[PDB]
Write a protein that binds this ligand. Structure first.
Ligand SMILES: OC[C@H]1O[C@@H](O[C@H]2[C@H](O)[C@@H](O)[C@H](O[C@H]3[C@H](O)[C@@H](O)[C@H](O[C@H]4[C@H](O)[C@@H](O)[C@H](O[C@H]5[C@H](O)[C@@H](O)[C@H](O[C@H]6[C@H](O)[C@@H](O)[C@H](O[C@H]7[C@H](O)[C@@H](O)[C@H](O)O[C@@H]7CO)O[C@@H]6CO)O[C@@H]5CO)O[C@@H]4CO)O[C@@H]3CO)O[C@@H]2CO)[C@H](O)[C@@H](O)[C@@H]1O
Ligand SMILES: [Mg+2]
Ligand SMILES: [Mg+2]
Length: 428
């Protein structure tokens, strides 16, 4: 095992994702924007194993690991390909747009180990792929739900399936010696608050303390998967800066959460886990696929500096935050923009920026009454209603875009926004 699988290697370029990118660029009138989409098609996105069919459907997990070898020989350097292990029973328990095919009360935990994990680790140990670095991101939006959403019965039912299921997946993956294991730990707009933060460091510690190799079973964590939270709020650098006689962490957008951006958040988690037993070799990944926040949307443009308005912390922070979402929990089909491009070791503690959620794939269907044949449990969630209000705080619009298909399907109108709003902007 290396300490950074992303150093000294190039990123796998999933051709099935780029097919959707290029075939839309072929359909895009504007010549400048179409050139940008062709450039976006060259970057490294992750490969989501989101159902048991995904192991075999199309080129399959095999064909991706095979295609990765084609790109390793072709380039001379090694290739790091990013797989997302995403099919726990009772999946996405606190929402409805990504409910999985396995569920606990239908012998789901047993099906998870037997039909999904086992065949994956089988393919992953074929010695033909020992020359790749295989990063495996373990079940986004799983353990975080057990910290803030156990009052919800769907998660409460699934705690053991999550722990036993995540432990089983990581134990059987540590045997493959070129797979690097990253546990998802959500984002700062979820676990930033003090008791949410502290509750996650306590839950995650025992989850891995019970793994086969203990604190050595994982290589780090990943944050901001499939979300829009920025790398850095540059014009709100200090959450304790007193404006109008109040610290600006008290603004209604943050509600006393001290972690405004994912860089402050991820590094805080890394120091916390280190001081509780984890080796200093752990590193955090940050999904930067849709957190650039360039362009203009939601009635605002990207700030070029702190706002002249010192009247309130609310007027100050709202005018200084790169994140323009009406409410920080607005997680669905947001009109953001592509963020930092995938790059290795951008700063101490961060292993690499990655694109885990592929730009262009939807977060959820935007109207009720539609069934996806391939994901029969994905449903309409009010957070994606383009005319609705957030179900976490009713006072704010969801901000979700309309005409969105079920989560995972290609969203051509959000992709155009994500490209136009990219920061750093797409250079053709
Ligand atoms: O085959 C087709 C193709 O399939 C492809 O793959 C797809 C795959 O199929 C998809 O399913 C997959 O999807 C992802 C979506 O893209 C994500 O958007 C989505 O994840 C959501 C999840 O649904 C949602 O439940 C979750 O919610 C969080 C939210 O992020 C967070 O902001 C919020 O925070 C709360 C917090 O919890 C509270 O504690 C908090 O409290 C404070 C309070 O406000 C304050 O008043 C008080 O003072 O203090 C309190 C603190 O104590 O409030 C906050 C509210 O702001 O909490 C929510 C949970 O409750 O968010 C996630 C996203 O972050 O779901 C999935 C997984 O992420 O994507 C893949 C790829 O696209 C294949 O690729 C392709 O090949 C196929 O063709
Ligand atoms: Mg490391
Ligand atoms: Mg900061």
């Amino acid at each position: 095992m290396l300490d950074n699988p992303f150093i000294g290697a190039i990123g796998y370029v999933n051709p099935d994702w780029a097919t959707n990118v290029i075939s839309q660029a072929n359909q895009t009138a504007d010549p400048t924007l179409a050139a940008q989409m062709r450039k976006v098609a060259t970057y490294s996105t992750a490969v989501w194993l989101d159902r048991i069919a995904a192991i075999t459907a199309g080129r399959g997990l095999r064909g991706h690991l095979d295609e990765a070898l084609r790109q390793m020989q072709q380039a001379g350097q090694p290739v790091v390909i990013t797989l997302v292990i995403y099919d726990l029973p009772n999946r996405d328990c606190s929402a409805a747009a990504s409910n999985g095919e396995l569920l606990v009360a239908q012998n789901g935990l047993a099906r998870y180990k037997a039909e999904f994990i086992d065949p994956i680790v089988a393919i992953l140990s074929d010695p033909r792929y020992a020359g790749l670095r295989i990063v495996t991101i373990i079940e986004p939006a799983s353990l975080p739900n057990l910290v803030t959403n156990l009052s919800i019965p769907a998660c409460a039912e699934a705690q053991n399936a999550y722990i036993e299921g995540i432990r089983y997946a990581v134990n059987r993956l540590r045997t493959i010696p070129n797979v690097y294991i990253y546990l998802d730990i959500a984002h700062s707009g979820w676990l930033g608050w003090d008791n949410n933060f502290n509750g996650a460091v306590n839950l995650y510690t025992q989850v891995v303390q019970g793994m086969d190799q203990g604190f050595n079973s994982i290589d780090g964590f990943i944050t901001n998967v499939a979300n829009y939270t920025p790398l850095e709020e540059p014009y709100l650098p200090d959450p304790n800066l007193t404006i109008a006689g109040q610290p600006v962490r008290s603004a209604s957008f943050y509600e006393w959460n001290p972690y405004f951006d994912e860089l402050d958040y991820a590094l805080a988690l890394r120091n916390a886990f280190i001081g509780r037993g984890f080796p200093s070799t752990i590193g955090m990944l940050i999904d930067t696929s849709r957190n650039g926040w360039g362009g203009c949307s939601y009635g605002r443009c990207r700030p070029t500096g702190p706002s002249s308005d010192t009247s309130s912390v609310n007027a100050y922070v709202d005018g200084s935050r790169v994140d323009r979402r009406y409410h920080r929990g607005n997680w669905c089909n947001q009109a953001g923009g592509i963020g930092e491009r995938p790059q290795a070791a951008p700063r101490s503690g961060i292993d690499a920026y990655v694109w885990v959620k592929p730009p262009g794939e939807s977060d959820g269907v935007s109207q009720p009454g539609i069934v996806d044949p391939d994901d029969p449990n994905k449903k309409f969630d009010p957070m994606c209603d383009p005319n609705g209000q957030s179900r976490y705080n009713s006072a704010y619009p969801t901000g979700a875009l309309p005409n969105a298909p079920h989560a995972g399907r290609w969203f051509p109108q959000q992709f155009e926004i994500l490209v136009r709003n990219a920061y750093p902007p797409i250079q053709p």
